[PDB]
């Protein structure tokens, strides 16, 4: 059924599973028209499909052309997401296909279930966790590939960089969700924390800086503070 704090370690067992987040699939800027009405302009988006055990991120870039001439785009976006996830699963060897797909928003359940009727053995599950994957477009290299795309495209990343050489996938996921929660709560501050020091760089084949173990502890503490901070600035506590 639903995924929550009580069955949290299930994410890191050896049953292949994927999270799917559709928040950034249909993205718009809202603007005034010459006549003083309001219109939207779509911008490129992405499906965020993540194996939490390995860090493999299947980033399907959603080019604005997929919306041309379509109606009810917020509804279509959920079905397009389900279509692309279904296509991804069908593209994988049987032994790489997921046994469960966990959607971050309940509105994705029926679209994905319908697209996956061919796969009765793949469980389609919601979650009660409030995961901060909407902030993926605050990762500069992911945002860059999305905004530069001129056509539909899938790009594979490891969102954990090389962390799994040194830490477990439980700890890597905890770090990732802390980083993304901070970027969602105060993007500028979070990014200043991450890049304030110019002697720690991001390797060409990585998303995050090459922090030592001790530096990650400091970074992690600064993100907790930021989140607690903003929570005061927000509620005046």
């Amino acid at each position: 059924g639903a995924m929550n704090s009580s069955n949290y370690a299930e994410l890191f067992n050896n049953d292949i599973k994927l999270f799917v987040d559709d928040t950034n699939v249909y993205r718009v800027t809202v603007h005034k028209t010459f006549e003083g009405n309001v219109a939207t302009k779509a911008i490129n988006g992405c499906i965020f499909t993540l194996n939490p055990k390995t860090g493999h991120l299947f980033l399907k870039i959603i080019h604005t052309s997929v919306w041309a001439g379509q109606k009810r785009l917020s509804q279509l976006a959920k079905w397009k997401t389900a279509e692309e996830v279904s296509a991804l699963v069908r593209s994988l060897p049987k032994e790489e296909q997921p046994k469960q797909i966990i959607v971050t928003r309940k509105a994705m359940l029926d679209p994905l279930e319908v697209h996956m009727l061919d796969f009765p053995n793949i469980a389609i599950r919601p979650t009660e966790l409030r995961l901060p994957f909407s902030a993926a477009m605050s990762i500069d290299k992911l945002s860059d590939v999305v905004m530069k795309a001129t056509e539909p495209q899938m790009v594979l990343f490891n969102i954990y960089d090389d962390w799994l050489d040194r830490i477990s996938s439980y700890t890597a996921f905890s770090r990732l969700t802390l980083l993304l929660r901070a970027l969602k709560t105060n993007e500028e501050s979070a990014k200043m924390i991450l890049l304030s020091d110019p002697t720690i760089t991001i390797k060409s084949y990585h998303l995050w800086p090459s922090f030592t173990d001790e530096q990650w502890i400091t970074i992690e503490s600064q993100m907790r503070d930021l989140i607690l901070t903003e929570y005061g600035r927000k509620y005046n506590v």
């Binding site: 079905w79 389900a82 279509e83 679209p111 319908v114 009727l117």
Partner: peptide, 15 residues
């Protein structure tokens, strides 16, 4: 939510 009810390639439409 059955294959009888849903044509491949018309998933959104048929549902």
């Amino acid at each position: 939510k059955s294959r009888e009810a849903i044509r491949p390639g018309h998933e959104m439409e048929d549902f």
